[PDB]
Amino acid sequence: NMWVTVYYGVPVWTDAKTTLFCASDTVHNVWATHACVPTDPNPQEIVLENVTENFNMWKNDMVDQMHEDIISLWDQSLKPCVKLTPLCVTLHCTNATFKNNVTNDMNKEIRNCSFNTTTEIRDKKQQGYALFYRPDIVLLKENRNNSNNSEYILINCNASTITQACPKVNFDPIPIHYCAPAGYAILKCNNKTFSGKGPCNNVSTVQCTHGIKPVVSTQLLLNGSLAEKEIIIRSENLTDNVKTIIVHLNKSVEIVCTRPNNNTRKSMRIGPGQTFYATGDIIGDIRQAYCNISGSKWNETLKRVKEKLQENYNNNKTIKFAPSSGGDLEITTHSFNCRGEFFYCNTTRLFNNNATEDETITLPCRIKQIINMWQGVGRAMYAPPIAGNITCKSNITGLLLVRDGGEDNKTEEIFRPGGGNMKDNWRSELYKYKVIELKPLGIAPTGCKRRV
Amino acid sequence: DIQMTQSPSSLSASVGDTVTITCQANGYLNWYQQRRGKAPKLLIYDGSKLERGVPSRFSGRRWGQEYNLTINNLQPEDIATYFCQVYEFVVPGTRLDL
């Protein structure tokens, strides 16, 4: 007759939630080497033939784990840095005066703020000054008798504590690899046209994944990776108007951004080993910061995006873009991080459906120093200046679009820039794989009987 | 696009009767009780689930694209217009008389 036989090491698994290890290759950058182990050298990928697995990018746990880890690491990376509490004092901010061709637009952005703060002794004060950008200055008790005596403060210094970033922290988005713990493994979908949700029929087992760059941006996705075969649109239900549309490009667009000013830096001491950095003066003339996007590459990219979006909806609809509907600055404009400088670039020249003949689109940008990155959660960070002009270059590899509501008796669909939820950017990379729990113990009938 | 229909335009019943209101849609639906007052009250969500605080008189079933909103043991308190919604689209409801 048939008897029960126990098999240990059976290649079966179930869906599970667990904690993954960080790994990276070889001043201490936030994340990475300070708290990570070595990567798996010469890693292998094992193709599982005749296996179909249901992957949902949206419900993946790895996104929440990455979000939590990044927030925690950032907070620690700011924990030992100089706090700016002693600088939340009355400021007197007047027009900055320069000797060389300052444009009338910049006279309203760079303010010369004089203030009385502490020095490195408990019983003495200093009278100092610094140049600040207008978005970081809040007005109090405007003096209508002598406008130069109006009071100002650093933005939100009355609400929370502003901490200056340590100058020795490396803010480069170094890719971090996620390794499964023992007993668990990561399954990856190798179906080049996978929508991000559904029964992937070409899968492989990965002990530890490739690295993902923790790039922070809004409206557009930067760096990361390109689609292998075509532009892919991922969006939960797709017809639900509160769900982001993620456009994963197969071809990048090069963008060059810059702060052309010298911004000569001054260092002022506040306390016993607590120092503050701020712009001292500017040598030369003053220009706005800006980004340069190639005209023809952008026009081709939008043509292809419109075609692929049209393929995912009713054929009797025109696809058009429109400028962002507004909201906080972090989502109204495109957010960068180039060597610690936070740029807020006006993208209304890219999404206005204006096929501008310009060879290079140029977008004006604002630069802000007091940044609350995680939608208001966390310590406010003060980004110190860097003397000299700054240039940077990056690849635009995707878009975050939001559908412009909906109605009947309409023959066109309008998409606008969106984003602001950092998890979506992290999904645009983590979507390729999910984590499984090995269940090696199985039973089956056979003719195996004990001699006993 | 999501297409919808709603029928009847009006309903008249006696107290204690069991009545149905039909809405057709290719998408997720919910139902609300709209009174001449402060706000509509949500009755049914998902294919057929009841909200907390709703008396056990309201029910529903789906088959294909049709939903019936079966209302058992109709009471005087149930005189209202019953609205049917798919996402941002709300279809004018059936006015119940009694």
Epitope: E236, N237, D240, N241, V242, S325, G326, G327, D328, E330, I331, Q375, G376, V402, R403, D404, G405, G406, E407, K410, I414, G418, G420, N421 | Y28, N30, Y32, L42, Y45, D46, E51, Q85, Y87, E88
Partner: nanobody, 121 residues
Framework: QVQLLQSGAAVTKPGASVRVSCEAS????????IHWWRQAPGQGLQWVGW????????????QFQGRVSLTRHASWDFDTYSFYMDLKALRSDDTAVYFC????????????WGSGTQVTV
């Protein structure tokens, strides 16, 4: 206890911008979208738009673009939020009751509604 309070009725003239407010309290506001609806007399409910309480992003349908500005102001410690609908190019056709509501699910299920602000033009 989830609560949405609204301002009282307002009467103005065509072309005069009108603000309708809704104050949310008693729950974690940051986790749910707030939607606005317009109910003209004798009609059904027209969708006006949604606002994300954490990012401030408005989303309005075509018929309200350039006319309706949705915003939000967070209070201290995020215990309450004040949401506003600013209607600019006001016309006599916009007489209606304006409602705020919470989206608690992926089905656009609106559990709690405000009292409704009557706007007459």
């Amino acid at each position: 206890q989830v609560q949405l309070l609204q301002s009282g009725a307002a009467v103005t003239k065509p072309g005069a911008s009108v603000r309708v407010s809704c104050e949310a309290s008693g729950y974690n506001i940051r986790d749910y979208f707030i939607h606005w609806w317009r109910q003209a007399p004798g009609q059904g409910l027209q969708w006006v738009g949604w606002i994300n309480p954490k990012t401030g992003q408005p989303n309005n349908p075509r018929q309200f673009q350039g006319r309706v500005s949705l915003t939000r102001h967070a209070s201290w410690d995020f215990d309450t939020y004040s949401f506003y609908m600013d209607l600019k190019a006001l016309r006599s056709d916009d007489t209606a009751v304006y409602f705020c509501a919470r989206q608690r699910s992926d089905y656009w299920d609106f559990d709690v509604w405000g009292s409704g602000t009557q706007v007459t033009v």
